[PDB]
């Protein structure tokens, strides 16, 4: 168990369910603390473990204000320079005594030198109880390694341009951060918000985050940047919607550095019935060639 | 009449000086407190005073972390349905003992029914010490009452070269006890985008000299997404004027249209190491609307 | 001697009552401001006063959103290296005009050099109006100086049934202008875990009556992870006392071991759905240390 805290009114959305960004920030905190503690076991160069990838997060059951969140983490795998961390988020009602599993996630972290930033160090190794666990971890590692290799016109209903949305945010201070960079939590909250906007615009009904499927942090964001979090619908099942979210970082004045793509993610959203079963959502129809390529790649991700 | 706090690390801008948004939020808080207490003075219908206009804010000298901010407020004038409030924000260094006058502003508030909102109620009158005070107040009131009646590939020093925008989804800690959001969140965002546009146009360090006309046209509720767009309007040889507009869109109801929630005019300058305004690059308008806005920027400059 | 602000939605819970943690941080802020101004009065070494002890905080009456808090402070007694500050928190309803005495506290601060931290400096003395004031101050100072020298499967209403803990990574708005964290957030987390254990033991709505001995043993720097652990010590027929302990371990430097940063005693009470205090279930000790802590908590209760 790496983090435990109380959900408060500011942790929720306007409706009263706790924000996806808050759950993501707790997940990141737990994974980062245990990964950082593990990569300084053998007392090497002083390092901090940075989140590089959210392999997957499942929103199994909703969390609400007043409940206590216990988020625990276990180090499954460590590569040459990366560590895989599995994290479980449970909610407990302190009066009712009930405890449910709210979220389940897998993340990837990599240690960065504190002395000379941008320098990756070698993860110390971990000892496994069963060899099948270690090879299954290696298989997942090689799978994720394999996987790694915006204009809007006048909109018609149920088109990509119709739901396409965007947030623009000036990154502020980070005083007590481990490094000079800002945590993935702020950016993930913004990504979740843009995904929710796109889903609600496309489906015109209640919506729920089913899962966040692949969050990649391409490079760090420093203070004084202004980030554009752009969200677009990529592919829809009959009962689910997929949203690509892209985070681009721009220097305000510094033309020494050019605009770059800082992060990318895929959100799977669903709308449920009063009973709690996934209801049919309107189907997205692509119009351009790139939209249809992204729809096909969404179907491929759907069946694999 | 009084509000006072200590400036802390989250209160600062990227530079490490107290954010302009934080100063504006404290000014709004002080004005709202004193006018709300005054508009329930005579024990009428229970009401709350809402900020409607920032007539002007002067950033005289910067404030820094660790200092204590003292914000004082005085009700200058009362109309039939509005209150004019003058506000001073002073900084106090608790170690050196030094105290500077950091900002000076005057605001306009309107009391709104708590029982039946959207109903504007009648401000109780204030008694003036001299008749000249009330006459100057009426003059200022009538002045403010009268005055209220897409970027392609850019070339440098144009409006399009500096034009920028922030987009924000209004969440739950932006709003008050009711669904409306404080003027503070919006003013902080306007200041941020104005600073962005000014830094893009002038390519050096800059500082807000004054905030000229913040008008709050309509309320913003939770669940809206607001676009705070900033563009440069007119430049002196040593000063720049930035227009900031707040547009609010309903996310889900496409029956409902986008509306203009707030508008303001920012004056930015770039200063020397000594502290004197240095020449800023000149804005050249390209379209007809750009120079129309440049011409009224010159008009505002000469008055 | 004074700080005042208006309470906003983030300072309160869903019901509209201000969190105890926010009141505690405001008390700390006011005390620190005046302690810092006094310990730089006569132009010694440039220093800032850090909160070391909360002698007691009484929650006399609740404060709610929209009311403005006026926090006043007075320097009661100063030792060789510490300053005693008494603080009153008053709430003002700006509509009804009513003002209540909400909370009253006594705190201890110690000046630390800004140039070389960990260096304690000598508090300048204060001149008393009556000799009895200084004599009572010396008595209280010597009293406080004297005073400073695992849950298995549980059965209901024992210590293990209620014992709880929070785990927190020091985040971005927790710290001061320097690497240390304000006492306010730490006290807020202590109040939260005390409320958690109290609600687990009492199965009702509950409220903090008073917090008695908050000691800040050592500072917490950025990059620590703190465990705020709370366990029940002794229960009256209508009151509960909860001991809260704050332990900090460094995440990155594994060279350093766990250390005890803070400790406090919270007394909680149980309310009805109407709002009347109901009798609380009696805590039963099982071990020898549990019964020692129950008896010494009773001793603290009878004082
Ligand atoms: C993570 C980061 C350091 C990657 O470094 P890099 O420039 O790609 O250098 P590398 O040569 O180490 O890249 C490959 C290796 O890095 C790690 N890595 C990089 N990207 C990864 C990804 N999407 N998923 C998992 N591991 C990744 C792995 O260690 C990978 O393979 P390995 O097993 O051979 O070590 C860099 O992209 C980054 O910092 N992104 C921003 C993360 C951030 O947000 N930081 C602020 C706080 S969250
Ligand atoms: C300002 C607001 C109340 C205007 O009210 P309205 O519905 O247009 O009603 P009216 O225009 O007929 O006028 C009512 C009074 O308000 C005054 N008023 C309205 N807008 C004003 C402005 N920008 N500046 C100065 N006075 C203004 C009017 O002068 C009038 O009083 P008067 O007769 O003494 O002149 C409305 O825009 C609003 O609700 N703004 C709130 C924005 C916000 O976020 N505030 C802080 C958080 S709630
Ligand atoms: C308070 C602190 C400076 C104590 O310093 P120290 O290393 O123990 O050195 P000493 O205690 O000998 O310093 C002497 C003074 O400190 C006072 N002091 C220390 N702890 C105290 C406490 N809990 N209550 C009251 N006084 C205390 C002593 O009474 C003494 O005063 P005196 O000499 O006039 O009698 C240290 O414990 C600390 O820093 N705690 C954390 C405070 C913090 O978190 N600051 C950041 C903002 S909250």
Short mmCIF file of C-alpha atoms in Angstrom, two decimals, chain B residues 2-6 8-10 25 29 33 36-37 40 47 68 92 94-95 175-177 182, chain C residues 2-6 8-9 29 33 36-37 40 47 68 92 94-95 114 173 175-177 182:
data_model
loop_
_atom_site.label_atom_id
_atom_site.label_comp_id
_atom_site.label_asym_id
_atom_site.label_seq_id
_atom_site.Cartn_x
_atom_site.Cartn_y
_atom_site.Cartn_z
CA UNK B 2 -10.34 44.97 5.16
CA UNK B 3 -8.81 41.73 3.93
CA UNK B 4 -5.23 40.58 4.55
CA UNK B 5 -3.23 37.43 3.79
CA UNK B 6 0.31 36.20 3.25
CA UNK B 8 2.60 31.92 -0.75
CA UNK B 9 4.29 29.85 -3.48
CA UNK B 10 1.05 28.92 -5.24
CA UNK B 25 -8.95 37.98 -6.82
CA UNK B 29 -12.99 39.74 -2.55
CA UNK B 33 -17.32 41.89 1.12
CA UNK B 36 -22.43 42.97 0.22
CA UNK B 37 -22.37 44.08 3.84
CA UNK B 40 -27.86 44.27 3.52
CA UNK B 47 -28.72 39.83 -1.35
CA UNK B 68 1.54 40.26 3.67
CA UNK B 92 4.17 44.60 3.84
CA UNK B 94 7.49 41.40 7.72
CA UNK B 95 11.30 41.24 7.98
CA UNK B 175 -17.90 28.26 -8.72
CA UNK B 176 -19.32 29.98 -5.63
CA UNK B 177 -21.88 28.42 -3.29
CA UNK B 182 -16.09 33.93 -9.09
CA UNK C 2 -4.80 40.33 12.32
CA UNK C 3 -5.57 38.36 9.16
CA UNK C 4 -9.01 38.13 7.57
CA UNK C 5 -10.49 36.46 4.50
CA UNK C 6 -13.82 35.03 3.32
CA UNK C 8 -14.90 29.67 0.05
CA UNK C 9 -16.22 26.27 -1.15
CA UNK C 29 -0.53 31.75 9.59
CA UNK C 33 3.03 36.51 10.86
CA UNK C 36 8.02 36.80 12.53
CA UNK C 37 7.42 40.54 12.69
CA UNK C 40 12.87 40.98 13.39
CA UNK C 47 14.68 35.20 10.61
CA UNK C 68 -15.54 35.95 6.73
CA UNK C 92 -18.68 37.52 10.63
CA UNK C 94 -22.02 39.99 6.34
CA UNK C 95 -25.79 39.69 5.73
CA UNK C 114 17.04 32.57 7.01
CA UNK C 173 1.48 23.32 -2.95
CA UNK C 175 5.72 23.48 0.93
CA UNK C 176 6.87 26.97 1.91
CA UNK C 177 9.00 29.27 -0.23
CA UNK C 182 3.57 24.47 6.35
#
